[PDB]
Amino acid sequence: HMLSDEQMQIINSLVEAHHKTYDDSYSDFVRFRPPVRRLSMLPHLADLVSYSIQKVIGFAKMIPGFRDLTAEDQIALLKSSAIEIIMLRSNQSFSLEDMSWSCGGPDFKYCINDVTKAGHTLELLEPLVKFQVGLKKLKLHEEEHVLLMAICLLSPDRPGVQDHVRIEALQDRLCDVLQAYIRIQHPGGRLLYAKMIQKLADLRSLNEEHSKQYRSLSFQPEHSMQLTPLVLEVFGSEV
Template sequence: VTVMRPHQLKAEPSGVPATLLHSHVAESALDHPQGPEANLEVRPEERWDHADLVRCEADSITGKLIVNADEKDEDTQICRVCGDKATGYHFNVMTCEGCKGFFRRAMKRNAGLRCPYRKGTCEITRKTRRQCQACRLRKCLESGMKKEMIMSDAAVEQRRALIKRRKRERIGTQPWGMQGLTEEQRMMIRELMDAQIKTFDTTFSHFKNFRLPEVLSSSHEIPGTLKAPTAEEAAKLSQIRQDMCSVKVSLQLRGEDGSIWNYKPPADNSGKEIFSLLPHIADMSTYMFQGIINFAKVLSYFRELPIEDQISLLKGATFELCQLRFNTVFNAEKGTWECGRLSYCLEDAAGGFQQFLLEPMLKFHYMLKKLQLHEEEYVLMQAISLFSPDRPGVMQRAVIDQLQERFAITLKAYIECCRPQPAHRFLFLKIMAMLTELRSINAQHTQKLLRIQDIHPFATPLMQELFSITDG
């Protein structure tokens, strides 16, 4: 199957040692499991060190602890008859499958077994259990296995029929199209969905203590006021404002007590609204980036790659995955991103939505939302974007290329199975085109971020690592 890929773009800066990001990837967040009450906070006016970033990263994971191989071996149950690996309780005793079957057959035959060595005390182990049936049966009975617990042939057949029926019922509860996918493809989608649920706080309930614009329209003062930009900075920001878009973003915050705070950008075009929102945007971006990093690390496909390639993939794709997640909370009818208690609204002085389409980022969100994608399609898009072999610094390109191919084929198969209607026959091509557009937006965004950072440094340490921003 031939699939289209996003075109290669060499916009992401590279070549800077990844220190904080390296610590993010090197220490698995799964080693520090947290419950649903985990509180991932962005703290204002603090200097974040390596421990802070690793701790915050761990807090956003709510998955189960993965025990290492040594710990699993210690907990492995052994057969009470022969010492082989047990599979569960059979006829009242923890045994292996072999001893379970032997005991059932021996009891049904009801044959008088005798020890060929005339000892009656043969040692029964995994290697010797076939040498003496009489002593093996004696060991089964001495271990506590009970003949009366053996089911009749009719009862066994009835139980097998029940298991088959329940299996059919489980398959019937799956989305209709999922039944047309291979088992490998279904497992791939399940792993992606599980990682998404564990690492994407769709309610943004753990996003706390973030910085807000200096003054909200309700006249509430926010602690930690920001210094005003210099005249030179304001002029440069004004130029950047014109480059970016004439559309402005307002912010609404719903308090826990029911109060509502609103921030609307200034009516002029001085660039002040960019400056006032920078700290908040940095906090929100960092929060989202941490979730993306954890998403990648939950995936077995990602963990199996060398850490250098993990870092290169994250530096290239984190912004793109962030936009895909933001699109899931985008309300195209209202022009708002609804992030829990926070709501970001597009302010259009012209009173229409036409000029929104002049800005590539806004056009992307509207066009992607129009496709009405399933959650499975969103996470497969994230995987295709993450495993891009042409990111700067990637070494195992062939391996990553094969992974991306598998995710793309799975997405195509999912669409064909779950969306058989003629209206969706070009959906896969549209999605791949959107990923290509997102790659272009990523390059543009990086350049704009570097220009703003050069005027007024605002990026958090994690943002600096991801976008390879050097000090000075």
């Protein structure tokens, strides 16, 4: 068959939303506290994540149907998915060659080791990089990548969600677009869809592990004082 106008318009909105919230040159990274190789990398990565959350929020407000949700559900969705949306969008900077996120010269190239200096362990980093590698290999089209982020963000299976019925529906309409798109516009993408949903499950586990490690980092004021207000608000338990 072939996509519908509404389906195609949703794709247009998401692709443009992402273009408007993701710089492939990473020129803003110089405004971040410099990276440094106890948790010497925490200041830079905190600023990177904080900047990124702001971007995820901008992209979110442009997901069709999201802004109609109550402010409470928007926040519930952002708070629980932010970390996953970030791991997803970061894949654009990940490189299978050097197994790192390359965003600049020697300074903005992030290795597993560097994240270790932000207070995280292999318990998290191993699966993360493993996830980044698997996702990169799916050679997603920008359209499928942007849909995967909108779909992940509209997971009604998040703590604190209220109108989990309307959220459920919205995620479904997006899932429909992604499925149609793959079938119609992506040759050899017969299994793709199923693989992409599997990626959402890996994100849940990564999310869980990150939350544990973040909690510890969070309870130590000497470390929490290195984070930013926004990061503290989005990853905090005060709901």
